[PDB]
Amino acid sequence: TFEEQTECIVNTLLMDFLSPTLQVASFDVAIIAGRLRMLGDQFNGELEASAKNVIAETIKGQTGAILQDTVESLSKTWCAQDSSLAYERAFLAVSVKLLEYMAHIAPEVVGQVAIPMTGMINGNQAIREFIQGQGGWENLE
């Protein structure tokens, strides 16, 4: 169900970015999507370089490798310059804001990133353990 919840959340986030009509016209994913977006906007680091690389490998069909390394690099950088921020919270924040920038910059291909990011979040124990330790997606933020 956690794996299925992650899938819905990443789909909702993406559909809201791509189509605001669908956001308006449509376990409450809408509230969760809101809190992850509120969290996502706390990241102000440079994304142009990151987004382009993740998009480029996503076309080629090597999203998994570059996507995780990109978010882990940006999160370690942000955690290095902010002692208060937990790594696992930084990770999610970057994942959301990177998905946001990739939708604005490349809406024709951003959809091919949804499954990789779903697999990334569901596959990472540190992030899964963190979210479930906050009372699951339902109570995160």
Q: How is the chain split into domains, by residue range?
A: 2-139
Class of residue 59 by CB neighbours under 10 A (exposed 0-12, middle 13-18, buried 19+): exposed
State residue 34 phi and psi, 5-degree precision. -65, -45
d(CA 121, CA 10): 10
Look up residue 135 and give its DSSP letter: T
HEC secondary structure over 38-101? HHHCCCCCCCHHHHHHHHHHHHHCCHHHHHHHHHHHHHHHHHHCCCCCCHHHHHHHHHHHHHHH
d(CA 128, CA 141): 15
Q: Indicate the resolution in Å.
A: 2.7
In the three-class reduction of DSSP (H, G, I as helix; E, B as strand; rest coil), residue 8 is classed as: helix
